[PDB]
């Protein structure tokens, strides 16, 4: 088992338990279930372990998947890296009110000028761009980049284009941001979303198998998102060496 | 009945969005499932069993310990109430690194492809034979009714050749008992008839029952071998270096003349601003 | 009222050639709370460039000139590209059904001419189909649905040039 | 009344091949990394049923204080009822029957049960 | 213990209506943990994130963020990992960062969340207490107030629950001191009929055989 021993050596030096504190990831929810994850060859992820105690014994539970969600999560972060360093604009949208202060923490701790954040309600017709708003409220505001105003008030950016329209909207709440995925499809913007099991996610371009149910997943996703967006790879090369 | 049941279940789950196709198996369903996996209409099949009503000990399908592909009915009617689970080919590539259950051995195409979101490419398959009326299409009539229907490959029968397409039906010039007509990309149906012309070039003049039949020959693995050895011969090309170097020399000519035109325009702007400076110096 | 025109569309009107066809103009009726019977003229404008990029535009307004102008500019906003064989015929046989209307469309070799019904003649000359035999079946009483059905039916077919890179298998010899 | 279908790359493709206009800027993203649209149907409701249910039903029927541990859901360290059921089950696949395994699990994990009942009586004196 | 658990998971993975391949790591990583096999009513270790005047923000890790009224929250539920209630100068200074002992009443509401309330229902504390003590008769007394007399005994309001002590396990002087508080001992309860059986702690527990 050279591959298995080599994989164990590869998996020897990392905190697997923190990754499996976020990605073990229990059920999204249990109600009227949508046309959810099918058992297929591309992200099957579907054990509905009912797990209840007698409301019919089957009422509230849904699927899980460890490997797929880690793979999709690293896949989506590499997707964020390529679209970022190809000079696009990344918008992060989640309109669930409970996780908003974490997004404010991310909006104050970010460093790259192209990652943008939104926390309030999704207005009707944000990506319609019918009347010329020069881009809607999620685009270019101090609310979108709170760090840009403060970093320029300090005046020192970590330092050695025009037409602000979105390039890739990532969605961290399908339930209160279903219209955001639909409007991004109407603007031909690719999307990254977390599956909740209720909304029609037939318009997600890059699905991530999380379910908006974890501060731990949000810390894991946002922490890698910030640690790849804040630091340029040559600095890591100089930092390790 | 099994051909129409097979193609009817294909029509079923394509129009219903189910990417798995599960049949009551036979000799026909097994053999022609190997046919459509060989041509790459689907990506693979496995025998499955409704394992909840297996006994305390019936025989059970172990996928690992069994060899990967059954090839007869009796091995697939030993057990109790099997089904054959087709792994439908969703996009315009087979996902050999996926290997969706059964499929081509070895996960290496040469260049990775597009990632299309198309649903399920066997599109509006039409059983044109029919258990009441069998239809022979003598092959020129088969061509003239091939333009009557959209793009795709007929599945046909002939006794000396077995379960065949329309392509070797025409190039061996025999009448063929056509079963149905799959919808397909035009590039795929082009690839089937091109490779079957190549097969007739290899099988030239052989006696017709001695033709390697269409279940015996996986097309996609052979084309994958052609891709692998072709990318190997071109990477280890040599004249490829000279081709690349003359491309480099063309690009260097383009950017050298671009840079020289840049220096000319900057000299023009410097000279004219110096001229305006000197003219304001004179007229003052 | 004011109809919209963008910036990057103004390389295209200076770019390709263009033709315009009104499909039909229709008067609908509504009895309303308060003042009576309000009508709108619904107009449907097709616009192509005779090289395989087609457009449709449906417009609704109170008067015929403003309705046809709105659908005229809406079509020129909304363009889709359709592959042909050398700008005269379609690749495959094409069958489709919008609302419940059975169009059947075939390729024909070039110089067949258009054997084709009334509005679809100007439509095929608009997008650039010179040699196609069609028939429409079902309730043919609406121009709008045969227009939308024809746009989707053009969008249905399959292209051979997305293979030769990745199929290992070269695609030529068109001699019948 | 049309039908939902494929999304955004077959929808961009037949425009983008002809030189309609330049793409939405994330084309390299859209091509280099594999997706899956939710090709939404039901291949079968996978209600894959937990084997731990009869053991946890019996243990929660016999020791209902095993409903009353504090437990960290987000760390995957197992609770006391799970070591009960896993001990009983590993004695099952060892070869013995169920009731002898239940007795051996009563002997081999009772110590944390009196520790827990001391803790619960302490919380009882705390609340009252 | 690892290999036998894994093979138990794989052996129960057989006999399912699909082939279910590439889904067994799902059950392996389920079995280490990730969800507990019975949920309704089970107390958890939960993490407090922030506390307001009324609604406290507490982790679930199972549907996100929990919401409990603060007027139910005490320092008693603050589960320190060492065995003591924490030394804090006041009684409701739940600082965010501690591990809290709360019960999931349901895993999902109509309104996007779970309930997850340790209500500090003192009556439910006595319910879990006395049900556990019915079990713990095989492995200290409980106070009650006597209220009125009738045929066969005396009416005791024990800790929010009204019971009725029979004549056989009753003390004599409980007739002549009706109205005052004194300690009693639980015997059993009948949950299908709501009858609770007690005794005086001075009356010795002569063996009542378990009629079942």
PDB file of N, CA, C and O in Angstrom, chain B residues 90-155:
ATOM      1  N   UNK B  90     -23.835  12.404 -19.547  1.00  0.00           N
ATOM      2  CA  UNK B  90     -24.564  13.657 -19.378  1.00  0.00           C
ATOM      3  C   UNK B  90     -24.069  14.744 -20.322  1.00  0.00           C
ATOM      4  O   UNK B  90     -24.870  15.496 -20.885  1.00  0.00           O
ATOM      5  N   UNK B  91     -22.759  14.839 -20.514  1.00  0.00           N
ATOM      6  CA  UNK B  91     -22.158  15.955 -21.226  1.00  0.00           C
ATOM      7  C   UNK B  91     -21.370  15.464 -22.434  1.00  0.00           C
ATOM      8  O   UNK B  91     -21.400  14.287 -22.798  1.00  0.00           O
ATOM      9  N   UNK B  92     -20.630  16.385 -23.050  1.00  0.00           N
ATOM     10  CA  UNK B  92     -19.937  16.113 -24.309  1.00  0.00           C
ATOM     11  C   UNK B  92     -18.513  15.603 -24.060  1.00  0.00           C
ATOM     12  O   UNK B  92     -17.553  16.012 -24.712  1.00  0.00           O
ATOM     13  N   UNK B  93     -18.424  14.643 -23.138  1.00  0.00           N
ATOM     14  CA  UNK B  93     -17.214  13.970 -22.685  1.00  0.00           C
ATOM     15  C   UNK B  93     -17.660  12.853 -21.749  1.00  0.00           C
ATOM     16  O   UNK B  93     -18.761  12.902 -21.198  1.00  0.00           O
ATOM     17  N   UNK B  94     -16.813  11.833 -21.591  1.00  0.00           N
ATOM     18  CA  UNK B  94     -17.264  10.600 -20.953  1.00  0.00           C
ATOM     19  C   UNK B  94     -16.912  10.547 -19.470  1.00  0.00           C
ATOM     20  O   UNK B  94     -17.475   9.724 -18.737  1.00  0.00           O
ATOM     21  N   UNK B  95     -16.010  11.427 -19.018  1.00  0.00           N
ATOM     22  CA  UNK B  95     -15.376  11.382 -17.688  1.00  0.00           C
ATOM     23  C   UNK B  95     -14.749  10.024 -17.405  1.00  0.00           C
ATOM     24  O   UNK B  95     -15.177   9.286 -16.517  1.00  0.00           O
ATOM     25  N   UNK B  96     -13.761   9.680 -18.218  1.00  0.00           N
ATOM     26  CA  UNK B  96     -12.840   8.603 -17.873  1.00  0.00           C
ATOM     27  C   UNK B  96     -12.118   8.778 -16.530  1.00  0.00           C
ATOM     28  O   UNK B  96     -11.919   7.753 -15.855  1.00  0.00           O
ATOM     29  N   UNK B  97     -11.669   9.980 -16.088  1.00  0.00           N
ATOM     30  CA  UNK B  97     -11.233  10.079 -14.679  1.00  0.00           C
ATOM     31  C   UNK B  97     -12.347   9.877 -13.675  1.00  0.00           C
ATOM     32  O   UNK B  97     -12.076   9.501 -12.528  1.00  0.00           O
ATOM     33  N   UNK B  98     -13.591  10.148 -14.059  1.00  0.00           N
ATOM     34  CA  UNK B  98     -14.703   9.690 -13.248  1.00  0.00           C
ATOM     35  C   UNK B  98     -14.808   8.178 -13.243  1.00  0.00           C
ATOM     36  O   UNK B  98     -14.854   7.559 -12.175  1.00  0.00           O
ATOM     37  N   UNK B  99     -14.738   7.574 -14.443  1.00  0.00           N
ATOM     38  CA  UNK B  99     -15.051   6.168 -14.685  1.00  0.00           C
ATOM     39  C   UNK B  99     -16.370   5.751 -14.030  1.00  0.00           C
ATOM     40  O   UNK B  99     -16.362   5.079 -12.993  1.00  0.00           O
ATOM     41  N   UNK B 100     -17.510   6.162 -14.589  1.00  0.00           N
ATOM     42  CA  UNK B 100     -18.776   6.112 -13.844  1.00  0.00           C
ATOM     43  C   UNK B 100     -19.270   4.685 -13.689  1.00  0.00           C
ATOM     44  O   UNK B 100     -20.112   4.204 -14.449  1.00  0.00           O
ATOM     45  N   UNK B 101     -18.731   4.018 -12.678  1.00  0.00           N
ATOM     46  CA  UNK B 101     -18.830   2.579 -12.621  1.00  0.00           C
ATOM     47  C   UNK B 101     -17.970   1.996 -13.718  1.00  0.00           C
ATOM     48  O   UNK B 101     -16.774   2.286 -13.814  1.00  0.00           O
ATOM     49  N   UNK B 102     -18.576   1.170 -14.565  1.00  0.00           N
ATOM     50  CA  UNK B 102     -17.833   0.549 -15.647  1.00  0.00           C
ATOM     51  C   UNK B 102     -17.585   1.543 -16.772  1.00  0.00           C
ATOM     52  O   UNK B 102     -18.315   2.518 -16.953  1.00  0.00           O
ATOM     53  N   UNK B 103     -16.527   1.285 -17.528  1.00  0.00           N
ATOM     54  CA  UNK B 103     -16.152   2.168 -18.612  1.00  0.00           C
ATOM     55  C   UNK B 103     -14.798   1.766 -19.138  1.00  0.00           C
ATOM     56  O   UNK B 103     -14.348   0.633 -18.967  1.00  0.00           O
ATOM     57  N   UNK B 104     -14.153   2.723 -19.792  1.00  0.00           N
ATOM     58  CA  UNK B 104     -12.843   2.472 -20.364  1.00  0.00           C
ATOM     59  C   UNK B 104     -11.789   2.407 -19.271  1.00  0.00           C
ATOM     60  O   UNK B 104     -11.789   3.210 -18.336  1.00  0.00           O
ATOM     61  N   UNK B 105     -10.885   1.436 -19.391  1.00  0.00           N
ATOM     62  CA  UNK B 105      -9.820   1.266 -18.423  1.00  0.00           C
ATOM     63  C   UNK B 105      -8.749   2.314 -18.624  1.00  0.00           C
ATOM     64  O   UNK B 105      -8.378   2.627 -19.757  1.00  0.00           O
ATOM     65  N   UNK B 106      -8.262   2.863 -17.521  1.00  0.00           N
ATOM     66  CA  UNK B 106      -7.225   3.861 -17.575  1.00  0.00           C
ATOM     67  C   UNK B 106      -7.807   5.249 -17.720  1.00  0.00           C
ATOM     68  O   UNK B 106      -8.515   5.551 -18.683  1.00  0.00           O
ATOM     69  N   UNK B 107      -7.534   6.117 -16.757  1.00  0.00           N
ATOM     70  CA  UNK B 107      -8.128   7.460 -16.791  1.00  0.00           C
ATOM     71  C   UNK B 107      -7.264   8.516 -17.465  1.00  0.00           C
ATOM     72  O   UNK B 107      -6.922   9.516 -16.827  1.00  0.00           O
ATOM     73  N   UNK B 108      -6.898   8.340 -18.732  1.00  0.00           N
ATOM     74  CA  UNK B 108      -6.036   9.299 -19.422  1.00  0.00           C
ATOM     75  C   UNK B 108      -6.529   9.618 -20.824  1.00  0.00           C
ATOM     76  O   UNK B 108      -6.197   8.912 -21.784  1.00  0.00           O
ATOM     77  N   UNK B 109      -7.322  10.672 -20.985  1.00  0.00           N
ATOM     78  CA  UNK B 109      -7.324  11.384 -22.267  1.00  0.00           C
ATOM     79  C   UNK B 109      -6.120  12.311 -22.319  1.00  0.00           C
ATOM     80  O   UNK B 109      -5.448  12.534 -21.312  1.00  0.00           O
ATOM     81  N   UNK B 110      -5.838  12.851 -23.502  1.00  0.00           N
ATOM     82  CA  UNK B 110      -4.632  13.661 -23.640  1.00  0.00           C
ATOM     83  C   UNK B 110      -4.840  15.071 -23.102  1.00  0.00           C
ATOM     84  O   UNK B 110      -4.184  15.480 -22.138  1.00  0.00           O
ATOM     85  N   UNK B 111      -5.743  15.827 -23.709  1.00  0.00           N
ATOM     86  CA  UNK B 111      -6.073  17.174 -23.273  1.00  0.00           C
ATOM     87  C   UNK B 111      -7.440  17.136 -22.618  1.00  0.00           C
ATOM     88  O   UNK B 111      -8.329  16.439 -23.105  1.00  0.00           O
ATOM     89  N   UNK B 112      -7.600  17.850 -21.504  1.00  0.00           N
ATOM     90  CA  UNK B 112      -8.915  17.988 -20.890  1.00  0.00           C
ATOM     91  C   UNK B 112      -9.821  18.845 -21.768  1.00  0.00           C
ATOM     92  O   UNK B 112      -9.345  19.667 -22.555  1.00  0.00           O
ATOM     93  N   UNK B 113     -11.126  18.649 -21.637  1.00  0.00           N
ATOM     94  CA  UNK B 113     -12.102  19.185 -22.572  1.00  0.00           C
ATOM     95  C   UNK B 113     -12.929  20.309 -21.961  1.00  0.00           C
ATOM     96  O   UNK B 113     -12.656  20.779 -20.852  1.00  0.00           O
ATOM     97  N   UNK B 114     -13.940  20.752 -22.703  1.00  0.00           N
ATOM     98  CA  UNK B 114     -14.953  21.674 -22.228  1.00  0.00           C
ATOM     99  C   UNK B 114     -15.739  21.023 -21.097  1.00  0.00           C
ATOM    100  O   UNK B 114     -15.780  19.799 -20.954  1.00  0.00           O
ATOM    101  N   UNK B 115     -16.388  21.842 -20.281  1.00  0.00           N
ATOM    102  CA  UNK B 115     -17.229  21.352 -19.191  1.00  0.00           C
ATOM    103  C   UNK B 115     -18.657  21.804 -19.450  1.00  0.00           C
ATOM    104  O   UNK B 115     -19.129  22.776 -18.849  1.00  0.00           O
ATOM    105  N   UNK B 116     -19.379  21.121 -20.336  1.00  0.00           N
ATOM    106  CA  UNK B 116     -20.700  21.611 -20.716  1.00  0.00           C
ATOM    107  C   UNK B 116     -21.768  21.119 -19.766  1.00  0.00           C
ATOM    108  O   UNK B 116     -21.637  20.080 -19.116  1.00  0.00           O
ATOM    109  N   UNK B 117     -22.840  21.886 -19.689  1.00  0.00           N
ATOM    110  CA  UNK B 117     -23.925  21.607 -18.772  1.00  0.00           C
ATOM    111  C   UNK B 117     -25.111  20.991 -19.470  1.00  0.00           C
ATOM    112  O   UNK B 117     -26.224  21.089 -18.950  1.00  0.00           O
ATOM    113  N   UNK B 118     -24.894  20.371 -20.634  1.00  0.00           N
ATOM    114  CA  UNK B 118     -25.992  19.800 -21.399  1.00  0.00           C
ATOM    115  C   UNK B 118     -26.536  18.598 -20.641  1.00  0.00           C
ATOM    116  O   UNK B 118     -25.827  17.979 -19.836  1.00  0.00           O
ATOM    117  N   UNK B 119     -27.830  18.341 -20.802  1.00  0.00           N
ATOM    118  CA  UNK B 119     -28.492  17.403 -19.923  1.00  0.00           C
ATOM    119  C   UNK B 119     -28.120  15.953 -20.131  1.00  0.00           C
ATOM    120  O   UNK B 119     -27.377  15.387 -19.330  1.00  0.00           O
ATOM    121  N   UNK B 120     -28.608  15.340 -21.201  1.00  0.00           N
ATOM    122  CA  UNK B 120     -28.336  13.935 -21.468  1.00  0.00           C
ATOM    123  C   UNK B 120     -28.434  13.753 -22.968  1.00  0.00           C
ATOM    124  O   UNK B 120     -29.532  13.801 -23.526  1.00  0.00           O
ATOM    125  N   UNK B 121     -27.307  13.548 -23.609  1.00  0.00           N
ATOM    126  CA  UNK B 121     -27.237  13.620 -25.065  1.00  0.00           C
ATOM    127  C   UNK B 121     -27.964  12.584 -25.931  1.00  0.00           C
ATOM    128  O   UNK B 121     -28.089  12.854 -27.132  1.00  0.00           O
ATOM    129  N   UNK B 122     -28.373  11.393 -25.477  1.00  0.00           N
ATOM    130  CA  UNK B 122     -29.321  10.649 -26.324  1.00  0.00           C
ATOM    131  C   UNK B 122     -30.656  11.370 -26.355  1.00  0.00           C
ATOM    132  O   UNK B 122     -31.430  11.308 -25.412  1.00  0.00           O
ATOM    133  N   UNK B 123     -30.925  12.050 -27.463  1.00  0.00           N
ATOM    134  CA  UNK B 123     -32.014  13.012 -27.537  1.00  0.00           C
ATOM    135  C   UNK B 123     -33.109  12.506 -28.454  1.00  0.00           C
ATOM    136  O   UNK B 123     -32.888  12.377 -29.662  1.00  0.00           O
ATOM    137  N   UNK B 124     -34.285  12.265 -27.872  1.00  0.00           N
ATOM    138  CA  UNK B 124     -35.523  11.901 -28.567  1.00  0.00           C
ATOM    139  C   UNK B 124     -35.333  10.654 -29.420  1.00  0.00           C
ATOM    140  O   UNK B 124     -35.522  10.659 -30.635  1.00  0.00           O
ATOM    141  N   UNK B 125     -34.891   9.591 -28.753  1.00  0.00           N
ATOM    142  CA  UNK B 125     -34.651   8.329 -29.430  1.00  0.00           C
ATOM    143  C   UNK B 125     -35.973   7.723 -29.886  1.00  0.00           C
ATOM    144  O   UNK B 125     -36.991   7.767 -29.183  1.00  0.00           O
ATOM    145  N   UNK B 126     -35.993   7.257 -31.128  1.00  0.00           N
ATOM    146  CA  UNK B 126     -37.236   6.832 -31.741  1.00  0.00           C
ATOM    147  C   UNK B 126     -37.107   5.384 -32.162  1.00  0.00           C
ATOM    148  O   UNK B 126     -36.276   5.052 -33.009  1.00  0.00           O
ATOM    149  N   UNK B 127     -37.914   4.527 -31.556  1.00  0.00           N
ATOM    150  CA  UNK B 127     -38.008   3.160 -32.032  1.00  0.00           C
ATOM    151  C   UNK B 127     -38.721   3.120 -33.377  1.00  0.00           C
ATOM    152  O   UNK B 127     -39.935   3.321 -33.476  1.00  0.00           O
ATOM    153  N   UNK B 128     -37.951   2.907 -34.436  1.00  0.00           N
ATOM    154  CA  UNK B 128     -38.512   2.919 -35.773  1.00  0.00           C
ATOM    155  C   UNK B 128     -38.859   1.521 -36.233  1.00  0.00           C
ATOM    156  O   UNK B 128     -39.684   1.355 -37.133  1.00  0.00           O
ATOM    157  N   UNK B 129     -38.259   0.508 -35.624  1.00  0.00           N
ATOM    158  CA  UNK B 129     -38.845  -0.820 -35.635  1.00  0.00           C
ATOM    159  C   UNK B 129     -39.671  -0.897 -34.367  1.00  0.00           C
ATOM    160  O   UNK B 129     -39.569  -0.043 -33.481  1.00  0.00           O
ATOM    161  N   UNK B 130     -40.450  -1.949 -34.267  1.00  0.00           N
ATOM    162  CA  UNK B 130     -41.736  -1.851 -33.624  1.00  0.00           C
ATOM    163  C   UNK B 130     -42.214  -3.286 -33.590  1.00  0.00           C
ATOM    164  O   UNK B 130     -42.075  -3.995 -34.586  1.00  0.00           O
ATOM    165  N   UNK B 131     -42.691  -3.757 -32.435  1.00  0.00           N
ATOM    166  CA  UNK B 131     -42.823  -5.203 -32.249  1.00  0.00           C
ATOM    167  C   UNK B 131     -43.939  -5.796 -33.097  1.00  0.00           C
ATOM    168  O   UNK B 131     -43.944  -7.001 -33.364  1.00  0.00           O
ATOM    169  N   UNK B 132     -44.874  -4.959 -33.541  1.00  0.00           N
ATOM    170  CA  UNK B 132     -45.833  -5.379 -34.546  1.00  0.00           C
ATOM    171  C   UNK B 132     -45.198  -5.409 -35.931  1.00  0.00           C
ATOM    172  O   UNK B 132     -45.223  -6.442 -36.607  1.00  0.00           O
ATOM    173  N   UNK B 133     -44.611  -4.295 -36.370  1.00  0.00           N
ATOM    174  CA  UNK B 133     -44.012  -4.220 -37.702  1.00  0.00           C
ATOM    175  C   UNK B 133     -42.488  -4.168 -37.662  1.00  0.00           C
ATOM    176  O   UNK B 133     -41.904  -3.134 -37.282  1.00  0.00           O
ATOM    177  N   UNK B 134     -41.801  -5.235 -38.032  1.00  0.00           N
ATOM    178  CA  UNK B 134     -40.370  -5.130 -38.289  1.00  0.00           C
ATOM    179  C   UNK B 134     -40.140  -4.440 -39.618  1.00  0.00           C
ATOM    180  O   UNK B 134     -40.940  -4.544 -40.547  1.00  0.00           O
ATOM    181  N   UNK B 135     -39.047  -3.689 -39.694  1.00  0.00           N
ATOM    182  CA  UNK B 135     -38.695  -2.962 -40.906  1.00  0.00           C
ATOM    183  C   UNK B 135     -37.262  -3.286 -41.315  1.00  0.00           C
ATOM    184  O   UNK B 135     -36.313  -3.093 -40.545  1.00  0.00           O
ATOM    185  N   UNK B 136     -37.119  -3.830 -42.516  1.00  0.00           N
ATOM    186  CA  UNK B 136     -35.842  -3.890 -43.203  1.00  0.00           C
ATOM    187  C   UNK B 136     -35.674  -2.585 -43.951  1.00  0.00           C
ATOM    188  O   UNK B 136     -36.616  -2.113 -44.593  1.00  0.00           O
ATOM    189  N   UNK B 137     -34.492  -2.000 -43.869  1.00  0.00           N
ATOM    190  CA  UNK B 137     -34.195  -0.824 -44.680  1.00  0.00           C
ATOM    191  C   UNK B 137     -32.974  -1.189 -45.510  1.00  0.00           C
ATOM    192  O   UNK B 137     -31.859  -1.270 -44.991  1.00  0.00           O
ATOM    193  N   UNK B 138     -33.216  -1.457 -46.783  1.00  0.00           N
ATOM    194  CA  UNK B 138     -32.148  -1.765 -47.713  1.00  0.00           C
ATOM    195  C   UNK B 138     -31.306  -0.508 -47.902  1.00  0.00           C
ATOM    196  O   UNK B 138     -31.861   0.541 -48.241  1.00  0.00           O
ATOM    197  N   UNK B 139     -29.973  -0.594 -47.767  1.00  0.00           N
ATOM    198  CA  UNK B 139     -29.177   0.513 -47.186  1.00  0.00           C
ATOM    199  C   UNK B 139     -29.244   1.870 -47.874  1.00  0.00           C
ATOM    200  O   UNK B 139     -28.999   2.889 -47.217  1.00  0.00           O
ATOM    201  N   UNK B 140     -29.588   1.926 -49.159  1.00  0.00           N
ATOM    202  CA  UNK B 140     -29.807   3.226 -49.778  1.00  0.00           C
ATOM    203  C   UNK B 140     -31.082   3.872 -49.249  1.00  0.00           C
ATOM    204  O   UNK B 140     -31.128   5.093 -49.052  1.00  0.00           O
ATOM    205  N   UNK B 141     -32.112   3.064 -48.973  1.00  0.00           N
ATOM    206  CA  UNK B 141     -33.308   3.581 -48.311  1.00  0.00           C
ATOM    207  C   UNK B 141     -32.993   4.014 -46.891  1.00  0.00           C
ATOM    208  O   UNK B 141     -33.598   4.955 -46.370  1.00  0.00           O
ATOM    209  N   UNK B 142     -32.045   3.330 -46.255  1.00  0.00           N
ATOM    210  CA  UNK B 142     -31.614   3.695 -44.915  1.00  0.00           C
ATOM    211  C   UNK B 142     -30.909   5.040 -44.918  1.00  0.00           C
ATOM    212  O   UNK B 142     -31.084   5.842 -43.995  1.00  0.00           O
ATOM    213  N   UNK B 143     -30.116   5.306 -45.954  1.00  0.00           N
ATOM    214  CA  UNK B 143     -29.531   6.632 -46.120  1.00  0.00           C
ATOM    215  C   UNK B 143     -30.596   7.686 -46.383  1.00  0.00           C
ATOM    216  O   UNK B 143     -30.557   8.774 -45.799  1.00  0.00           O
ATOM    217  N   UNK B 144     -31.568   7.379 -47.246  1.00  0.00           N
ATOM    218  CA  UNK B 144     -32.552   8.397 -47.599  1.00  0.00           C
ATOM    219  C   UNK B 144     -33.576   8.618 -46.495  1.00  0.00           C
ATOM    220  O   UNK B 144     -34.287   9.625 -46.510  1.00  0.00           O
ATOM    221  N   UNK B 145     -33.676   7.699 -45.538  1.00  0.00           N
ATOM    222  CA  UNK B 145     -34.474   7.982 -44.353  1.00  0.00           C
ATOM    223  C   UNK B 145     -33.602   8.456 -43.199  1.00  0.00           C
ATOM    224  O   UNK B 145     -34.121   8.838 -42.147  1.00  0.00           O
ATOM    225  N   UNK B 146     -32.276   8.422 -43.365  1.00  0.00           N
ATOM    226  CA  UNK B 146     -31.400   9.000 -42.352  1.00  0.00           C
ATOM    227  C   UNK B 146     -31.422  10.516 -42.402  1.00  0.00           C
ATOM    228  O   UNK B 146     -31.160  11.174 -41.392  1.00  0.00           O
ATOM    229  N   UNK B 147     -31.726  11.091 -43.561  1.00  0.00           N
ATOM    230  CA  UNK B 147     -31.910  12.531 -43.642  1.00  0.00           C
ATOM    231  C   UNK B 147     -33.328  12.958 -43.310  1.00  0.00           C
ATOM    232  O   UNK B 147     -33.592  14.158 -43.226  1.00  0.00           O
ATOM    233  N   UNK B 148     -34.238  12.009 -43.133  1.00  0.00           N
ATOM    234  CA  UNK B 148     -35.597  12.279 -42.705  1.00  0.00           C
ATOM    235  C   UNK B 148     -35.652  12.610 -41.221  1.00  0.00           C
ATOM    236  O   UNK B 148     -36.471  13.433 -40.803  1.00  0.00           O
ATOM    237  N   UNK B 149     -34.750  12.034 -40.436  1.00  0.00           N
ATOM    238  CA  UNK B 149     -34.660  12.155 -38.990  1.00  0.00           C
ATOM    239  C   UNK B 149     -33.398  12.925 -38.604  1.00  0.00           C
ATOM    240  O   UNK B 149     -32.475  13.044 -39.417  1.00  0.00           O
ATOM    241  N   UNK B 150     -33.327  13.485 -37.386  1.00  0.00           N
ATOM    242  CA  UNK B 150     -32.142  14.261 -36.998  1.00  0.00           C
ATOM    243  C   UNK B 150     -30.894  13.411 -36.823  1.00  0.00           C
ATOM    244  O   UNK B 150     -30.863  12.208 -37.081  1.00  0.00           O
ATOM    245  N   UNK B 151     -29.840  14.085 -36.371  1.00  0.00           N
ATOM    246  CA  UNK B 151     -28.501  13.512 -36.377  1.00  0.00           C
ATOM    247  C   UNK B 151     -28.349  12.419 -35.333  1.00  0.00           C
ATOM    248  O   UNK B 151     -28.682  12.606 -34.160  1.00  0.00           O
ATOM    249  N   UNK B 152     -27.832  11.278 -35.770  1.00  0.00           N
ATOM    250  CA  UNK B 152     -27.577  10.181 -34.861  1.00  0.00           C
ATOM    251  C   UNK B 152     -27.471   8.868 -35.616  1.00  0.00           C
ATOM    252  O   UNK B 152     -27.657   8.817 -36.828  1.00  0.00           O
ATOM    253  N   UNK B 153     -27.210   7.811 -34.855  1.00  0.00           N
ATOM    254  CA  UNK B 153     -26.785   6.533 -35.402  1.00  0.00           C
ATOM    255  C   UNK B 153     -27.891   5.519 -35.184  1.00  0.00           C
ATOM    256  O   UNK B 153     -28.358   5.340 -34.057  1.00  0.00           O
ATOM    257  N   UNK B 154     -28.306   4.854 -36.254  1.00  0.00           N
ATOM    258  CA  UNK B 154     -29.239   3.745 -36.157  1.00  0.00           C
ATOM    259  C   UNK B 154     -28.557   2.574 -35.466  1.00  0.00           C
ATOM    260  O   UNK B 154     -27.371   2.342 -35.678  1.00  0.00           O
ATOM    261  N   UNK B 155     -29.297   1.844 -34.636  1.00  0.00           N
ATOM    262  CA  UNK B 155     -28.892   0.503 -34.219  1.00  0.00           C
ATOM    263  C   UNK B 155     -29.592  -0.531 -35.085  1.00  0.00           C
ATOM    264  O   UNK B 155     -30.821  -0.522 -35.205  1.00  0.00           O
TER     265      UNK B 155
END
